[PDB]
Design a binder for this molecule. Structure first.
Ligand SMILES: OC[C@H]1O[C@@H](O[C@H]2[C@H](O)[C@@H](O)[C@H](O)O[C@@H]2CO)[C@H](O)[C@@H](O)[C@@H]1O
Ligand SMILES: [Ca+2]
Length: 451
């Protein structure tokens, strides 16, 4: 069996490498430094902090909020296992880092900054984070009542709500602040019902599923953290505008939970909150189709056992769906026979990410892991070139790469930003999955681990 403690410890550490702004003194690596300290200067605000999205240095607040919410979800479900591993403190520190940044992006009730950095310009430069802000300006982008962005504002509300949920027992003052910001951002999103202003992320993180599942997503997290039934009532109200499986009348089920489509996770949380069969059927339709099949149709699988939804961030999809299987299979209302099927599914997907096919797909872990992730700072080029140096100067511990194709084929290639891609959302659900696997199978993390 694989060391799920070591994997978990590193999958969490991966986020330290993504940090932007003035780093705290408690960081565990010696190669990341302060960066992009002027973020927000163009609008008179302190918009520093947060995570760089992927191997670039743009801060995209839609996938960032998604990542924070999933990280908080891991704590919510597997707090005790995360403490026993000794990594709960690090994971909590990262959640607050992202949420602190979301709060700074919300200086007024109906003004939310959703992006720092221009996508096209930032991607022209292959330079480390500590040098990026000298090469090109980093403008701030915002939405308001006249140019609204309901998807991203609702997504950030979910993140702050989930943050308040896990910080309420340790820092109630901080939890109260996050809740206040979440309900404001929720009201902002619900009032505008539009993405007319969400324009800086076009061609990078444009959603087509709609902001309504983001509303149910946020409404459930607000209720779990605050108990205000008003936001549970609003969550169930917008279920009828979730995506529907084509050629049917079911709630969509043949995709997966991801930064673009959160109605999957929303259905799981609403099932646990309300115990209604509407949500239980929807999530069980999804997890059934992803395992044994539903109505004679089944998600594609590679011969080596990987659930292969699509070629873009395939492992992000498998590990994330696997995490949902963990949470639901551990639920008391889950049919027992379906529980064993779902959890065996989760272990196989986890083991595939860790090296069941013959090689780890987690940088710096296991056998023959990827060594050339499409990541500017870990590569650390001295001349604006992906090819120079020919080896990464730094190890991007814990990063889950895009993954192999449908025939289990994969090759290291710093230039392939699909197969060798890494990103915040790729590791989000992965943490939750490993937390469960550690709880069940153990495997001790590296003591005193430093990068
Ligand atoms: O936005 C996804 C991905 O983009 C990467 O930049 C690409 C860019 O999208 C493409 O149009 C251009 O031709 O090539 C660059 C890379 O050479 C970016 O490097 C990634 O960080 C980002 O995740
Ligand atoms: Ca959506």
């Amino acid at each position: 069996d694989y060391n799920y403690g070591e994997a978990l410890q590193k999958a969490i550490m991966f986020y330290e490498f993504q940090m932007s702004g003035k780093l705290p003194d408690n960081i565990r690596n010696n190669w990341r430094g302060d960066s992009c300290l002027g973020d927000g200067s163009d609008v008179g605000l302190d918009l520093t902090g947060g995570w760089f999205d992927a191997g670039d240095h743009v801060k995209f607040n839609l996938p960032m909020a998604y990542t924070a919410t999933m990280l908080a979800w891991a704590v919510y479900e597997y707090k005790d296992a995360l403490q026993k591993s000794g990594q709960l403190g690090y994971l909590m520190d990262q959640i607050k880092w992202a949420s602190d940044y979301f709060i700074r992006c919300h200086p007024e009730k109906y003004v939310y900054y959703y992006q720092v950095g221009n996508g096209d310009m930032d991607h022209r430069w292959w330079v480390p984070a500590e040098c990026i802000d000298v090469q090109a300006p980093r403008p701030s982008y915002k939405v308001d009542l006249s140019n609204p962005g309901s998807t991203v504002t609702a997504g950030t509300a979910a993140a702050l709500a989930a943050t308040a949920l896990v910080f309420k027992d340790t820092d109630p003052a901080y939890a109260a602040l996050c809740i206040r910001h979440a309900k404001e951002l929720f009201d902002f999103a619900e009032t505008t019902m539009s993405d007319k202003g969400y324009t800086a992320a076009l061609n990078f993180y444009t959603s087509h599923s709609g902001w309504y599942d983001e509303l149910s997503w946020a409404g459930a997290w607000i209720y779990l953290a605050d108990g205000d039934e008003t936001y549970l009532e609003k969550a169930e109200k917008y279920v009828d505008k979730w995506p529907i499986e084509s050629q049917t009348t079911y709630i969509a089920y043949s995709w997966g939970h991801c930064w673009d489509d959160v109605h999957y996770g929303a259905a799981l949380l609403l099932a646990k909150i309300t115990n209604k069969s509407l949500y239980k059927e929807a999530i069980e339709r999804h997890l059934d189709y992803w395992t044994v099949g539903f109505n004679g149709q089944r998600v594609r699988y590679t011969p080596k056992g990987l659930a292969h939804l699509t070629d873009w961030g395939v492992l992000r999809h498998a590990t994330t769906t696997a995490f949902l299987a963990c949470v639901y299979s551990d639920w008391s209302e889950c049919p027992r026979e379906k529980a064993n099927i779902y959890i065996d599914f989760a272990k196989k997907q986890a083991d595939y990410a860790l090296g069941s096919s013959g090689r780890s797909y987690v940088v710096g872990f296991g056998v023959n892991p990827p060594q050339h992730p499409h990541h500017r700072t870990a590569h650390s080029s001295w001349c604006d070139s992906q090819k120079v140096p020919e080896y990464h100067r730094h190890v991007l511990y814990g990063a889950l790469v895009g993954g192999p194709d449908a025939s289990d084929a994969y090759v290291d290639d710093i230039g392939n930003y699909v197969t060798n891609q890494v990103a915040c959302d790729y590791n989000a659900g992965f943490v939750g999955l490993l937390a469960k696997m550690y709880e069940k199978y153990g495997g001790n993390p590296i003591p005193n681990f430093m990068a």
